[PDB]
């Protein structure tokens, strides 16, 4: 009977929409039992199987649906989603284009094709496809919300206010009707949503992991109640898909090795394969135990492995980012599970116990926005490996081409040795700063930059054009290795004016909103000789910023764009700027540390979300409270003062330059020790028989 089968299929679609996935699977299967050649049932069953993490089984049923019905467009589009999840981009593309070929009016297929363009970095094409999807189906939350993020990326602010209004109403309606919100947890920081909505969004995405582990039917793990199996050592497991060339490793790659081997046993669990970088090599070498979980794709077997190691504290460094396997944490293989560093927000999930943060980043008055208990580090929870990765930026010298501290800059490990070979250096009491006079050697260096030469040799010392690092040493340019030569960095290299204040921001452009640019234009207008230094991140966002700046009163020549550079050049060229203007909507985090290590003062205005407060926490630990604004006026006034009071600028720049070293901000050893105290606080609380509570010291 078709009717018996049709009713079972339709009822299963209902169960699926209600979030009852188990019952949906059951009813689809009973439909196929009645009517085995049921194309819709095969495709629908494959959708919920995909949602349960059973990807290969899903593919089988999609193909069966297509055999039965060769022009079943829904099956092609749904199959593509599975292939995309399996990282088979080409396969996904071919399914989407096929479905669209079968039915050009298929809105879902256009929206799914758009997501591929988006994830490939082809934003204009993603935008066009999302608009085609919305044109065919105006009520389409996934298409609208992802379009909104596309427009955010390229700083398209057309009808921005109506866009926010729509986004919030979409989330509201979706939460009320118990749907998976079309706004991603990470993206929710960018929109004017309540804290309640943001945590709810995170909670729903956490639920997706529960769907994938319920099918495993694993029992609760037993957990260690002492440190006797581990000889009194606390067993800590760090779980990350980012052990390699990723901002995460650029922050904490030294931490596993800094740990006290007398009290701690470090297990690193990698969710990604080896990329061959020195970043991956270091962690593998310095951790007590390194486990490649990308060899164990079954979350059941993987979580089994973690549990066999006897982990006391398991650390989530991914959150809701690519490469995450949060199913591992949902299975609770460890008695204590904490979020750390990788994800700037709450998991919203019950399977997480703590978020490691600090008082400045996550004050008690806003603890409501987190589902975890707060675990305070004594200063900032943030850390960087800059002291290890870029020690060549610890000292610097300049050339008097006329005394500026950021017009023509030299750095190098062997810089002091080179300066000793020069009989006419002046030491300007600012640490102090060596100045090379405009002599034969200075002329040769400036000639190299002007003629675009790669590298010259002076007194046996290699002097490198800062723009040519990849041509000289790839590993040095990526930060895998410390540069060996003396590098030259000039404002002429990036078309920056010699006689003007340079305000910079090296974040991705999505972090900028119309409110922020307004605030920047106010500052530029009050500092006559000043430019704004931004990155083509991505480049297609450039004409948008330029146009909106015109509408705010800024001529185009006031804004200077540079391309994104290799890691080392990016950190180093921050020395050329006078002041960094931080983005209030979402701060620089890694790039915040990048700027401060260059000795550049950063002006910030902390908001309510975690992501909007990280810069203020960094500056607090750094010891520069005068760079922290309490509102937009104060933000503007601080920035305008630094740009106009040049003695105050000299004082503040000098302060930051000294404090990179003397403050605990880049001190990975002091960090690791403090992090160990927090771990022990966590463990004793549990070992004494307590459920997690705020470890706010």
């Amino acid at each position: 009977c078709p009717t018996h089968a049709d009713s079972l299929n339709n009822l299963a679609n209902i169960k699926r929409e209600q979030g009852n996935i188990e019952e949906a699977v059951r009813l689809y299967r009973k439909a196929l039992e009645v009517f085995p050649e049921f194309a819709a049932a095969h495709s629908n069953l494959a959708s919920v199987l995909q949602q349960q993490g059973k990807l290969q089984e899903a593919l089988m049923h999609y193909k069966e649906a297509i055999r039965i019905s060769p022009t079943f467009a829904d099956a092609y589009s749904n199959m593509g989603n599975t292939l995309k999840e399996m990282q088979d981009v080409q396969g996904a593309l071919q399914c989407y284009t096929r479905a669209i070929q079968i039915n050009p009016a298929f809105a879902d297929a256009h929206s799914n094709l758009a997501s591929i363009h988006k994830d490939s970095g082809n934003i204009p094409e993603a935008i066009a496809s999302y608009r085609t999807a919305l044109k065919l189906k105006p009520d389409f939350p996934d298409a609208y919300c992802n379009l909104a993020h596309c427009l955010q990326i390229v700083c398209d602010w057309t009808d921005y206010d109506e866009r926010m209004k729509k986004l919030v109403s979409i989330v509201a309606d979706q939460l009320e009707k118990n749907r998976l919100p079309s706004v991603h947890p990470h993206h929710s920081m960018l929109y004017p949503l309540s804290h309640g909505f943001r945590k709810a969004i995170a909670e729903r995405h956490g639920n997706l992991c529960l769907d994938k582990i319920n099918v495993l039917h694993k029992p609760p793990y037993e957990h260690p109640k002492d440190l006797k199996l581990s000889d009194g050592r606390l067993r800590v497991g760090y779980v990350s898909s980012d052990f390699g060339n990723h901002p995460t490793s650029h922050l904490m790659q030294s931490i596993p090795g800094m740990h006290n081997p007398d009290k701690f046993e470090v297990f690193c669990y990698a969710l990604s394969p080896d990329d061959g970088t020195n970043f991956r090599v270091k962690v593998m070498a310095e951790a007590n135990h390194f486990i490649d979980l990308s060899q164990i794709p079954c979350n059941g077997k993987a979580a089994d492995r973690i549990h066999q190691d006897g982990i006391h504290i398991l650390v989530n460094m991914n959150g809701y980012t690519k490469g995450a396997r949060n199913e591992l944490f949902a299975l609770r293989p460890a008695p204590i599970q904490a979020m750390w560093l990788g994800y700037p927000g709450t998991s919203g999930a019950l399977f997480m116990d703590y978020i490691i943060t600090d008082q400045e980043t996550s004050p008690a008055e806003v603890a409501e926005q987190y589902s975890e208990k707060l675990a305070y580090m004594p200063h900032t929870f943030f850390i960087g490996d800059h002291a290890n990765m870029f020690p060549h930026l610890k000292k610097k010298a300049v050339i008097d081409f006329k005394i500026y501290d950021n017009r023509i800059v030299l750095n190098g490990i062997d810089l002091k040795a080179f300066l000793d070979s020069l009989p006419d250096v002046k030491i300007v009491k600012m640490l102090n700063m060596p100045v090379i006079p405009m002599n034969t050697i200075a002329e040769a260096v400036i000639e190299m930059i002007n003629r675009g030469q790669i590298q010259i040799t002076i007194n046996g010392f290699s002097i490198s054009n800062g723009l040519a690092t990849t041509q000289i040493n790839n590993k040095a340019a990526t930060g895998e290795e410390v540069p060996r030569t003396i590098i030259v960095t000039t404002r002429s290299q990036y078309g920056l004016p010699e006689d003007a204040i340079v305000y910079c921001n090296f974040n991705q452009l999505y972090k900028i909103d119309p409110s922020t640019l307004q605030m920047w234009a106010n500052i530029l207008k009050r500092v006559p000789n000043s430019v704004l230094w931004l990155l083509r991140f991505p480049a297609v966002g450039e004409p948008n910023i330029q146009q909106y700046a015109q509408n705010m009163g800024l001529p185009q020549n006031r804004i200077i764009f540079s391309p994104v550079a290799p890691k080392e050049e990016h950190v180093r060229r921050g020395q050329l700027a006078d002041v960094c203007l931080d983005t209030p909507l979402c701060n620089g985090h890694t790039t915040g540390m990048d700027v401060l290590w260059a000795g550049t003062p950063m002006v910030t205005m902390p908001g309510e979300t975690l992501a909007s407060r990280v810069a203020a926490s960094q500056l607090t630990c750094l010891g520069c409270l005068e760079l922290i604004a309490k509102n937009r006026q104060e933000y503007e006034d601080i920035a305008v003062k630094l740009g106009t009071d040049l003695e105050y600028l000299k004082k503040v720049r000098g302060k930051v330059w000294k404090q990179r070293i003397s403050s605990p901000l880049f001190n990975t050893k002091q960090y690791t020790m403090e992090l160990e105290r927090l771990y022990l606080q966590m463990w004793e609380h549990y070992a004494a028989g307590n459920k997690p509570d705020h470890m706010i010291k």
Binding site: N44, N81, S111, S115, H149
Partner: peptide
């Protein structure tokens, strides 16, 4: 190349088919 950043995969939309 372009810098590796903190990245997130864009969600897709499954289509449920009703039998009529």
């Amino acid at each position: 190349s372009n810098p590796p950043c903190e990245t997130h995969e864009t969600g897709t939309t499954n289509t449920a088919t009703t039998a009529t």
